[PDB]
Structures are given as structure tokens and as C-alpha cells.
Design an enzyme around this catalytic site. Sequence first.
Site, PDB file in Angstrom:
ATOM      1  N   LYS A   1      -7.467 -10.812   3.879  1.00 21.47           N
ATOM      2  CA  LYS A   1      -7.873 -11.425   5.138  1.00 21.47           C
ATOM      3  C   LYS A   1      -7.514 -12.904   5.132  1.00 21.47           C
ATOM      4  O   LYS A   1      -7.986 -13.660   4.277  1.00 21.47           O
ATOM      5  CB  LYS A   1      -9.371 -11.240   5.371  1.00 21.47           C
ATOM      6  CG  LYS A   1      -9.884 -11.943   6.613  1.00 21.47           C
ATOM      7  CD  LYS A   1     -11.369 -11.711   6.793  1.00 21.47           C
ATOM      8  CE  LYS A   1     -12.181 -12.938   6.478  1.00 21.47           C
ATOM      9  NZ  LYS A   1     -13.447 -12.922   7.268  1.00 21.47           N
TER      10      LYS A   1
ATOM     11  N   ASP B   1     -12.506 -20.002  10.710  1.00 19.48           N
ATOM     12  CA  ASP B   1     -13.364 -19.139  11.512  1.00 19.48           C
ATOM     13  C   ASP B   1     -14.441 -19.991  12.179  1.00 19.48           C
ATOM     14  O   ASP B   1     -15.391 -20.427  11.520  1.00 19.48           O
ATOM     15  CB  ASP B   1     -13.981 -18.049  10.633  1.00 19.48           C
ATOM     16  CG  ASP B   1     -14.810 -17.064  11.423  1.00 19.48           C
ATOM     17  OD1 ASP B   1     -14.657 -17.019  12.661  1.00 19.48           O
ATOM     18  OD2 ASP B   1     -15.613 -16.333  10.807  1.00 19.48           O
TER      19      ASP B   1
ATOM     20  N   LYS C   1     -20.334 -20.101  15.816  1.00 17.04           N
ATOM     21  CA  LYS C   1     -21.124 -20.359  14.621  1.00 17.04           C
ATOM     22  C   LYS C   1     -21.926 -21.654  14.750  1.00 17.04           C
ATOM     23  O   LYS C   1     -21.552 -22.551  15.509  1.00 17.04           O
ATOM     24  CB  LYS C   1     -20.223 -20.454  13.390  1.00 17.04           C
ATOM     25  CG  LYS C   1     -19.803 -19.128  12.785  1.00 17.04           C
ATOM     26  CD  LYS C   1     -18.838 -19.345  11.626  1.00 17.04           C
ATOM     27  CE  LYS C   1     -18.470 -18.030  10.954  1.00 17.04           C
ATOM     28  NZ  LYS C   1     -19.683 -17.230  10.615  1.00 17.04           N
TER      29      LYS C   1
ATOM     30  N   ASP D   1     -12.278 -18.861   4.526  1.00 16.50           N
ATOM     31  CA  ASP D   1     -12.241 -17.494   5.016  1.00 16.50           C
ATOM     32  C   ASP D   1     -10.866 -16.860   4.887  1.00 16.50           C
ATOM     33  O   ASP D   1     -10.691 -15.713   5.317  1.00 16.50           O
ATOM     34  CB  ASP D   1     -12.704 -17.445   6.473  1.00 16.50           C
ATOM     35  CG  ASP D   1     -13.732 -16.366   6.714  1.00 16.50           C
ATOM     36  OD1 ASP D   1     -14.679 -16.260   5.901  1.00 16.50           O
ATOM     37  OD2 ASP D   1     -13.599 -15.634   7.721  1.00 16.50           O
TER      38      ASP D   1
ATOM     39  N   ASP E   1     -17.648 -13.106  16.266  1.00 13.32           N
ATOM     40  CA  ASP E   1     -17.677 -13.681  14.923  1.00 13.32           C
ATOM     41  C   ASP E   1     -17.458 -12.640  13.837  1.00 13.32           C
ATOM     42  O   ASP E   1     -17.179 -13.007  12.692  1.00 13.32           O
ATOM     43  CB  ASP E   1     -19.000 -14.403  14.654  1.00 13.32           C
ATOM     44  CG  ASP E   1     -18.901 -15.397  13.489  1.00 13.32           C
ATOM     45  OD1 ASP E   1     -17.786 -15.593  12.953  1.00 13.32           O
ATOM     46  OD2 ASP E   1     -19.944 -15.963  13.089  1.00 13.32           O
TER      47      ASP E   1
ATOM     48  N   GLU F   1     -14.866 -10.942  13.241  1.00 14.44           N
ATOM     49  CA  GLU F   1     -13.457 -10.842  13.598  1.00 14.44           C
ATOM     50  C   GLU F   1     -12.547 -10.550  12.408  1.00 14.44           C
ATOM     51  O   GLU F   1     -11.427 -10.069  12.607  1.00 14.44           O
ATOM     52  CB  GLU F   1     -12.994 -12.136  14.284  1.00 14.44           C
ATOM     53  CG  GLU F   1     -12.441 -13.223  13.334  1.00 14.44           C
ATOM     54  CD  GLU F   1     -13.472 -13.805  12.367  1.00 14.44           C
ATOM     55  OE1 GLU F   1     -14.626 -14.043  12.787  1.00 14.44           O
ATOM     56  OE2 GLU F   1     -13.120 -14.036  11.184  1.00 14.44           O
TER      57      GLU F   1
ATOM     58  N   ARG G   1     -12.973  -8.193  10.299  1.00 15.43           N
ATOM     59  CA  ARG G   1     -12.798  -6.748  10.416  1.00 15.43           C
ATOM     60  C   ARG G   1     -11.613  -6.412  11.303  1.00 15.43           C
ATOM     61  O   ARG G   1     -10.893  -5.441  11.051  1.00 15.43           O
ATOM     62  CB  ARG G   1     -14.046  -6.102  11.017  1.00 15.43           C
ATOM     63  CG  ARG G   1     -15.357  -6.444  10.379  1.00 15.43           C
ATOM     64  CD  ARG G   1     -16.455  -6.201  11.393  1.00 15.43           C
ATOM     65  NE  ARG G   1     -17.785  -6.072  10.807  1.00 15.43           N
ATOM     66  CZ  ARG G   1     -18.455  -7.064  10.236  1.00 15.43           C
ATOM     67  NH1 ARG G   1     -17.916  -8.267  10.083  1.00 15.43           N
ATOM     68  NH2 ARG G   1     -19.695  -6.844   9.803  1.00 15.43           N
TER      69      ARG G   1
HETATM   70 CL   LIG Z   1     -15.932 -10.431   9.403  1.00 10.76          CL
HETATM   71 MN   LIG Z   2     -16.497 -14.282  10.984  1.00  8.80          MN
END
Ligand SMILES: [Cl-]
Ligand SMILES: [Mn+2]
Lengths: 468, 468, 469
Positions: free
Chosen positions: B242, B247, B254, B265, B324, B326, B328
Site C-alpha cells: 500500500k 492520508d 482525520k 502510510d 478514510d 481508503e 483497502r
Molecule cells: Cl485503510
Molecule cells: Mn486511512
Amino acid sequence: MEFSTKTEILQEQQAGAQLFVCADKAPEHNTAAHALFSALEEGQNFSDTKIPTDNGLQAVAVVRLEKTDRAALNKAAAEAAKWAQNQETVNVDVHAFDEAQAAAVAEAFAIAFGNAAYRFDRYKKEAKPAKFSQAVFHSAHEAAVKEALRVAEAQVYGQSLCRDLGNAAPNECTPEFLARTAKAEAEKLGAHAKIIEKDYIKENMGSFWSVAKGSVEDPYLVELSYFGAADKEAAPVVLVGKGITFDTGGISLKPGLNMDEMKFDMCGAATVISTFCAAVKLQLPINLIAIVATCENMPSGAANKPGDVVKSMKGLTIEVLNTDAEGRLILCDALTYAEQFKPKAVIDVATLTGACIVALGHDVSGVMGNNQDLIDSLLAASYNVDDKAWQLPLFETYKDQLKSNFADIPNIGTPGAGTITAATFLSYFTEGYPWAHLDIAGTAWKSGAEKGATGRPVPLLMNYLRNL
Amino acid sequence: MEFSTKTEILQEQQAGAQLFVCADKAPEHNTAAHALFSALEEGQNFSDTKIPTDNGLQAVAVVRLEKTDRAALNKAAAEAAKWAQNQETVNVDVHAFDEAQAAAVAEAFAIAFGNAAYRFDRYKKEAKPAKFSQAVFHSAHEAAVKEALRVAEAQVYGQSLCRDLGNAAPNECTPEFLARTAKAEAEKLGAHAKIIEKDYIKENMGSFWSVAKGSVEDPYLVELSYFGAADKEAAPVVLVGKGITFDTGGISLKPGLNMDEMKFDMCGAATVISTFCAAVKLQLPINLIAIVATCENMPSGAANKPGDVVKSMKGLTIEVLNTDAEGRLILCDALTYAEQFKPKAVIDVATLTGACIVALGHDVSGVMGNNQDLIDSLLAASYNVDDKAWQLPLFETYKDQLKSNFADIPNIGTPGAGTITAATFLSYFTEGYPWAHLDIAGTAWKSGAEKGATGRPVPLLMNYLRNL
Amino acid sequence: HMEFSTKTEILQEQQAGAQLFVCADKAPEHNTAAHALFSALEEGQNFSDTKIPTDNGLQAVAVVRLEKTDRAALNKAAAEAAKWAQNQETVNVDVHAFDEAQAAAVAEAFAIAFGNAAYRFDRYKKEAKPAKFSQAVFHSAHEAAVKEALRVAEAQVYGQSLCRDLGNAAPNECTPEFLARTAKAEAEKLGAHAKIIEKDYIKENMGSFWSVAKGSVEDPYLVELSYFGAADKEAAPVVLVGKGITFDTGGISLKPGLNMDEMKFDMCGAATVISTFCAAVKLQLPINLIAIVATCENMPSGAANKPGDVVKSMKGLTIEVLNTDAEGRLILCDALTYAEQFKPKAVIDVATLTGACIVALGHDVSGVMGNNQDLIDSLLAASYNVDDKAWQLPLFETYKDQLKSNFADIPNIGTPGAGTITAATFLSYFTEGYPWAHLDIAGTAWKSGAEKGATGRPVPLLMNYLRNL
Ligand SMILES: [Cl-]
Ligand SMILES: [Mn+2]
Ligand SMILES: [Cl-]
Ligand SMILES: [Cl-]
Ligand SMILES: [Mn+2]
Ligand SMILES: [Mn+2]
């Protein structure tokens, strides 16, 4: 609810509701049940109808069991039980199965029947009980099914007692109420019970006492004893239960939303008391001790303050950084209390951490311990009854999150791994015997329209005892 | 930081810093090192001093290894490494161990030395690098130590690249930066790389695209290829990472506190890119593919909105309930992209859920997957290098938390088991190959005074590759 | 997708298909299974069904016991029967136990419940799972009254299904363009007329509307639906005004992330207006009807509305945008000014306007506010006729004291308290020229949880108001 057995085929002219547990073949000599099975759709595994007779409407239903695993069996039994609870008499045919499957089907369906018929109408003006009273299982394997119904009656008995104690309001189910009920239930089954009172607790169980001092309700420690093994002096299994009959958080007060559900913070104690009684009812060949520490966590002018340092029964000093982490503080003393019995195994059950729900959810209990053979035994029982559980690790590095400049150990750790940290705290008191910890904060009750105690993990614990 | 080997005993007259890794016997032919070992206290395992000589102050240190486990070894090596980074030359004596132990000691100390010398001075006016430049390991088992240092150099190479990519500021380490850097590092070692661009992504990776459309930064999919097996057509191992280079949460924005750490991230991408390059540097006899989907999750007038329904590459429609969650959404398309390689095994690495820190903490990675043999392999490597990991279950009952009345699946589930739920969402896209998922949200970086990327789980993943 | 027909004879026991007997106090006479079901009904039980084995398969038989006669009790029994009816391909309903007026009422309520129960939104799903229900046949000796009841039912189900389709759609499909063009096609499929105003006119003449839309990449639209079914095609029309924020993030005054997906329902006011308009045309009501829908997206961006901005409305008042999440007011006020060029007989606007309305009245009662008590009383009457509950909140003059600004003519939000009334008061500055009422449907337009979806309300209320003009 009563369960009995017959050897004859379930006759079409038999009075009462008729349920046919089928595999892949439709029932042959029942017209309505054949039509129901023949009409089952792709994912449908239950179907029911009401047939007009001269003696009223007769309820006929079929269940389709394609798979054999206990999870699929439980699922079919639950769906049928929602129908069976409205039938005064249910005759269940399980002739489509060999001896082993018929006993398994009978156990799961009897358990589902008994649990669905449960009602907690104690405080209601008018009781609305279920019509279900009797279930008759038709099978050519009478011996195995009769034994299956014996296990089923014991598990439902335990789950019902557990649900009654968890569902009760905290102003009825006070610590004294819990102690008095545990003593009476154990003695009605011929077991032994002693109630330790607040004098001993304040003097010898200082961690336990500091949580309880803040309420007007006296604390109690309950000891339930059963010696059913051949060797009455063989090392016993000890069950330890958290009995915070209501948790406000203390000075570290909880938010007001959904706080009513903190009446379930004694479900660990209820699990322990009910499994103990279920074991005695089964006449299991084991030596079993049940220990329950129970009190109230209330805010008051004399309650535990954050930063207080208290002396546990073991002798370690605990810095109470957060007064809402109070179940640890009654458990560690109860676990120290447990080692006087020189136990073969100690299992504690507690609605301990909300983090367990974040970790594993509402359908899987958490397991941690210092003895991998004991943990594997509990997971084995978990799989046997589909009362799901999963192990979390007690690595030594989690002890690094528990440091205090003032006491031997803090009652909470640095942020992260909340469920494991609390188990790690407890582990400082369980180094002297094989020990496992069941965090049931997610599985002991459900919310929403069906809010109430679940009776879990009584199925797991009772299956563990049967396999000792 | 270069590591070399000699066969002679470390003589007291050697220039530079002198380090004696001892077991239970004090070093014989060094007066200062003997005094340090003799004075070690109960828990003391490292001791150092500065001896006045005619060529300046000479640094002398000892390490006491009582235990033999890798965890105890890594711990001693880390303590010694904090001292070694300030010495230009460190001569290490490891003669107190047989061939197998000497190779293990050299590997862990070289790893600890190299990682401690790491600095990220890229944006600072004056670089303050470490003084450490060379370490020489004295042993009579030159062959085994030479191989251990070869492994150590590869792991330090990978962890440094991983940390360099994770530590980089998001306005430098844009998705393009990450893609072009991965391409340049892979090609520098003789591997292959192709960069898929936004036209293909918008057309074929709608879930991936819906996350990226809201930023001004173009998305990229990076494919790294290495064919080191005897049969260059044998089934490859595929690593999926990923690469959300920053993010914000999107419209599901957030909180502002600690949001800088969301530059980490893409550590999953960094883990995969770096582990890939380390394997090529080791010249491992395997076929390896690395897939990285990288983009930015920004709020804008064109961003993903809560309630949007997007069509994944596989074809399933996803309801974006929370923008959030995201990571995934880029992973599932990357996992679908992976199955064209007909992989032997797929391991994805992601800083996926904050719930994993609640479940396992900051020092244990989460492992979930559909193939227990693959999970057991990863856990084995986890134990080999003491890069700790633990398995969380993918029961079918977690799929019950993922229902939507509008799309095939929602991108988040009902509350509880946040880490398992995210993997369960991902499991819908990996049903065609053996698959495992590493949630490194807690282990990929640390905070506070030592804020930075850790480079984990590159040690775990690289060991898994060496044991294929 | 569902069909309703009528027969005059009693439902005979040999009739093929599912059989439903809507009873009062007497059991059905010539159906053995239906008699047995009715005889076994318990104290509060009012629906019961079974499956009788026949030579042509299992036959579904059901009964309903209607003790009370009010529409609320009627809707409740019909809804319970509808959960059974959607799994029956053909349902023959016998309503012979009732006089002409009650038989028409039973048929209308049961047909409405049947059609709404058969609704599905499988548009984005891999496999469509539609309901088996296709046809209901009502057996009665009152053919004219039952036929007319089914005609009303078909129109209301038609409107609610259209309304639910628009509300349930994902925001990236139901964009402002999608909503505008869908409204145009539905009106024109029924022979009405439609015109779409585009962003040029909006930016130039509707500054308040425009300031909400500028922060998104989606263009805004104003849709005008026209139907002249009165004898005098130039008589004063009824105007329906709908808020069509196809998704509301809040803008710079950004919303919390929890449950924000449900902000795809913030165009249900527009969906109500579009569907009620189409239902009225489908009924061929003898009225002149105008539907106005302003639609756009409320997004955060580098060009979005900022708190403290002062914008010039279409009427000319300057509005201080104190909170960019109170943006539905800002597209409504310009639509309401647009409406007065039609010299309307009555203007009703529909909007999911305030979360405060849910605090005031809950999830099952819509709020009604306006400047004309006869118009409000009419909407309440229709509310009672179909049991689509609504309640009036007062537009006292003292609420205007909560709307003061030292910078603009009026602020877009007021001092704390009475959030729903305060918003209506803001709107009231733009509706002083015609009889006006306001429907706050923020609680009634959709459900949450396992049954999350659009409800189609208040289409039942609005359509009855038009039928009673
Ligand atoms: Cl996530
Ligand atoms: Mn996230
Ligand atoms: Cl606790
Ligand atoms: Cl608004
Ligand atoms: Mn607590
Ligand atoms: Mn708003």
C-alpha cells in the site's frame, strides 16, 4: 423445558408440532413435510406450515442439513428454535442419521430449543412466556440420544442461570445477591459453598478492597466446591470470575451512553457460577472450585483515587492510574486466593477490556495464558461447540508497557494492546500455576433490540470440563 | 558502513575501538576488557571505557551473552550498537563461540551496527552523520561469518531504503517519486520495472482510481520483476504494498493531531520495494514480483464522497461508506492485478488499520490470510529474526459485518474487529491464490523523541524469502 | 412493475395462486384454510398465513383481522400483509366483508403496501434479487370505488418508487446533471414539459445558489417542470420547490465522518417534488402544477464558500454565510425567489433541512412551517388522510430576533435554539409574496440500520394535498 426420546417413526397422525430434520431426502410418510422439503429454494434450510385438522392447526416444519460441521448444525438448530418456541409440543424426527450424527443433532436442537424458550420477565407486569414445554426426539439410537439430551439439559440449565444473573438489574443483583444466589444454587445441587465477607477482604485482599470501599454495598468472595473425581484429593480445576455487579468507572467515571450495559460486568462471575453448577448437574468426574470476587465500583467521597497505591494480597503494590480499570484489581487478589488450592489449572473469566471487542469483535472471545497446553484445551472446547475463541500472545515485551515510578506495577499500561496489557497485569499474580484468561467483554452480551446476556462462554467452559 | 572479517585473535595493540563479545568467560588478552567484564553487575550486559594511549583515547567495550535466543542476541547487539555508532572503527572479537553461534552473533551485531548508523539528514542544513565506518569481526570461522555479513548487509540495505522512503516528506515522496525511486533501485540491481500510469488505472482500477482522483498527484502502479530461480517460468512470489504517500482521510477527514505521521502510510509500499531489492542484492534463487499501488488521499471538489459506489477491477461494486478507509480501496485492485502472475503466494503489506495497534500494540505485526501454510511460514520467519508477529482469524462470521443494501460489499463493517474486518474485505479479492496480509500500522514507525520509520517488517519478509 | 385488477365474485377456494382474506370480525365462510387461520388468531394477532399442499404445489393462504377502521390501523395491517405478499407471484384479495367506502380504503392501503414492499434497488449489485410479486386482484362488489382506489395507489407507488430510486442512488451516479436530466425525462415521458437552466444563469442571477455550488466540480442545475391540467391553463399554479443537494459534506464547515454516507439523501426534497409532480401528471389531476428543483454539490475546495462570506441572493438581500453546512437554505431561498415569477396560488418547498427537526419531532413525523395557515391546514389534512404524519411548528415573529448580522441583511444561521424554526424563518424572508409552507423531511425521508434506504416520504402527503385541491 423437558426433552424425551422415542424409537418409533414420527407418525403423521401424532398430535402436536412435527419437525423433520432431513439430510438430502424428503420425509416419506408425511404429506405436508414432503411438500415443504420439495419446495426448498437454493439457500433455504427451514420451512414451516400450519395444516388444518379436526384438532386445530397442526404445525409441520422441515430442516435441511447438507453439511455436518457443528457450526452449520448450530445454525440450523437456531432457525428451527425460533419456530419451536411457539409450539407447546415438538416431535423431532432424526431417523435420517446414524448414531453419531443423531446424537449431535439432538444435542444442538435441544440446546437451541431450551435457549430460545428462555424469558426474563421478572420485572414485567404481565409475563409473556413461550409456549414451548416438551420436545420428543424420534431415533433408533435411544442410548446415544438420551445422553445427548442430558448434556443439552445441563448446558441450557447453565446458560439460563448465567443469563438470569447477567440480565438482573444491578439494584437487585447486588454483590450480596450474587453471593447468596451462588451459595443457594451450588447447595441445591449438593455442592459446597462458603461466603468470605468484608472483614477478611479489607485485611487480606487490599486490591480487591480498594475497588469496593467506594460503594455502600458490601463486597463478597464466594467459594464453590465440588469433588466429583475418583481421587477426591486430586488437584482441582479452579474457575475465577469477575463480579463487578455494576461499574460506573469510579472517579474515572464512564460516559453516560450505554452505561446500563455495565450491569453485564459480572458475566464473568455468572459464567463461573453457572458452569460450576452445570458441571455438578452433569455429575462430571472432576474436582472443581469456583471463586467469585464481587463488589460495586461507585464514585463517592471515599472511593479509589487515581494515583492511589494499594497493596495486593500477593504483596505487590499497584498504582491505580485509572479507576475504571478495576476488574484487574479484584481479579489479581482472587487469583492469588486461588493458589492456596494447589490447582491443576486456573481459568479466569472476565468482561475485562473493551479493546478485546476492537481486537476480535462481538462473536469471538479472547484467550491468553501462561500454559499453552491449557490454552489449547480451551480452544479445543471452543471448536467442539462453536463458541468461538482466539488466542492473543503474552509476549514478555508487553511487560515493558507496565512501568511505575511509585509502585511495583501500574494497573494500566502505555497505550496499545489494551487486552494483552490487562492480561499481562494479571500474569504477575498467576506465575505459580497453569493459567488462562477469557476476555468475554464482547461475547457475554448483545445490544439493540435483543439486548441481554448471551450465556457465553458457558458452552466453551462446560465442554472444556467434560474433556478433562 | 562496511563489514569485513579476519581470522586472527583481536590483539590488545590493534588501533581503533575494541569490542569483546563474551559468553561467560572474561577476555584473556586485554587488560581493560577483562576489568569491564569482571565488574559487570547482575543485569549488566554491556560496559565500555576509554583507555589513554599514545595515539589518543581508545574505546574498549564488552558484551555478555548469557542466553542464546535471537531476542536476547538482538537486545545485546542494540545496546552495543548505540556505542558503536560513535567509533570510526570497531574491532569485534567473537572467538568465544563455535561456528554456528559466531555467524549468528556477527549477523545481529552487523545489523544493529548498520541500523544505528542510519541518519536522515536530507533536509537539514548541516548533516551530522555517525562516525561509524568500519567493523571487523575476528573469528576462526571465516566462511560462516562472511555469509552472515552478506545477509546483514542486505537487510541493512533494505531497512535503510525502507526508512529513507518512509521518513521522506510527503511533498518530496509523492506517488511519482515512489514509483520512479522503486524503478531506479530495482534497475540498479539488474531487476526489471514497469510503471503503469493513470490512464490504465482510471480505465481498469476504478476502486484504486476513486481514491486518487481527489488529489492533484497522478497515481502510479509499479511492477518490479526478478527471476532468480533455475526455472524462470516457475510460479513467482508476489509482494503487494500500500503506497498511500499521505492520508488525510479525504472527505472523511482525520483529526489534526499527529497527522504528520500519516506520511508513513506508504511504509507497506516501502517494505515491499525494499524487501524486493534486498532479495535481488542477496541474489536469492527465487522468482519475485513486487506490486505497489501509490497515490494521495486528499479532500477536494472531486474527491471520493461517502456513499459513492465504485466498480473494482475484479468487478465487485464497493460502497465507500467512509473515505478514510481508503487503503483497502487501492489494495483490492492491486490484489486483483496480482492474480495474472499466477502466483505461488501473495503477501500484501499495509499500514491498514489503527485497530491493529489496539489489538497487538506497537511491537507485534498482525498476520491474516486464507492459507495457513503461508501464514505459518511468515510466523516462522517472524521467530527467526525476532520481528514479532501474531495471527488473527479470518472466520467466515466476520463477513457478516460487511453488508450493504446498495453495493456488493461496503468498505467498512459494523463496529468491532476493525483489523480483521479490513482483511475480510480484502479476502474477497484474494480467493484465487494463497494469500497473507501484514498489518504493520503499529510496527512501521515510532513516535516521540525517536520519531521515524523502523523499517519493519523488512527483517521478517526478507527471512521468509531466504527460507523459500 | 406491479399490476392491480378487480373481480366482482367471491374468492373461491379453488382459485389458483395465493389467497388473502381481509376480514373484519367474522371468519371467511367458504375457505377451510382461511377459516382455520382466522379462528386461531390470538389477542393482538392480526395477520396469519399458511401453505396448504395441493396437487399443483403449495398454496399460500392468509387472513387479516381489521377491528379498527382508521387509516393508521389500516396501513399497519397492510404493511404486515405486504411482507408476506411480496413472496407470492399472484395474490387474490377478498374484501367482501366491507362496505363500498371501507372496501375502497382497504384496497388502496393494501395495493400501496404491496407495491412498496415489492420495491428493490439492485442497480449496483452483481445479481438482481427481485420480488416474486407481480399482480394483486381485489374481489369486491364495489367495482367503481375499488378501481379508483387502485388508480390512486398506482400513482402513489409510482411516485414513491421514483423518489426512492433517486434517493437511494450513489452520489457519484446521482450527480446534479443526473438528477436534472432524470427529472426532464420522467416529466416528458408523461407528456408534461421541462426546462433545464444551466450554470450561466445561476451564477449571474442566483448568487446565493451559486456560492454553494462553486466548491464542486459538478455543475449546478435548476429544473422547471410544468403541467397545465386545469380548465384554465393560465390559472394560478401550485408550485413545488425542492432542495437537491446531491451530496452534502458541509464544505469548509465540514461534517463528521460518521454516517455521512446518509447525506446522499439530501436531495430527497427534490426527489419528493419530482415524484409528486410526476404522480400528479400520471393521475391527470385537473390542476396547474409547477415543480422547481435547484441541485448542486456542497464540497470543500480551494474555491468553496468560506464562513463569513457575504453573498447577494436572487431577491437582493445580502446573506452572511456564518456556517457553510447550512447551505440548503442558500439554494432554497433563490429557488423561492424564482418561484414568484409564476404568481403562484401556493408554494410548498420540501427539504431535508435541519437535524434539529429530528430532535423536535423524531424520525416518523415531518415538520410543517409556513406563512399561510390555510395552506398549512391543508397539508396537515392530507397528512391525516394518508397517515403520513406531520406537525406544525410556529413561525412567530420573535424567532426573527435570532437572525441578526452586523455585516449583511440576514445571517444564514441564528443564535442557538429552535434550529428548525430558525431555518424556516430565514426562508420566510424570501416567500412573503405568496402563500407558502415548508416541509422539513430530514427525519422522514430515509431509514437507517439494516433497512437503510429512502422511504419516499412525504410523497403520500403531497400527492393527497394535490388530489384535494
Ligand atoms: Cl485503510
Ligand atoms: Mn486511512
Ligand atoms: Cl478492568
Ligand atoms: Cl440547510
Ligand atoms: Mn471497568
Ligand atoms: Mn448542510
